[PDB]
Amino acid sequence: DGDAAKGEKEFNKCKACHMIQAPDGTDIIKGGKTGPNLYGVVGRKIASEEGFKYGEGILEVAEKNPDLTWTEADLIEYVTDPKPWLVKMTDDKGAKTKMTFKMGKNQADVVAFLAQNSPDA
Ligand code: HEC
């Protein structure tokens, strides 16, 4: 029951490292490039952005769970704190994350907005 409208505002916390750009190159939310493009993230295979240099931990999660694609629930869990999520999914205490940013509240709203921007999910 996240609110995508509120989620768009919440996205201001993410924009410094992530943009939302359509495959055609259309900017939905102009943002940085430290992190991968979030357009179509819902339903997308974990760490699958082309040309994006992902960290070791998330690549390990993809490798270990090949069929894993991001679901809204997983996304909410991950943005809460990537660290523990990665430890959980890799069973590796030392799992490294390139994303240290944590979102302790309003996770569902931001996820709802990501979903709005994952039209073909
Ligand atoms: C704002 C609340 C957000 C949200 C919703 C997301 N991020 Fe980030 N992010 C950053 C980096 C360097 C990465 C790559 C991580 C790595 O390799 O370990 C990510 C990755 C993500 C994902 C995974 C994307 C995938 O393709 O699988 C998701 C869903 C995600 N982020 C959401 C870096 C940053 C930041 C840099 C300082 C900031 C701020 C954010 N992220 C913010 C958010």
Swiss-Prot record:
Binds 1 heme c group covalently per subunit. It comes from the Bacteria. GO terms for molecular function: electron transfer activity; heme binding; metal ion binding. Heme c binds at residues 14, 17-18, 99. Keywords: Electron transport, Heme, Iron, Metal-binding, Pyrrolidone carboxylic acid, Signal, Transport. The keyword Electron transport applies. This is Cytochrome c-550. It comes from Paracoccus denitrificans.
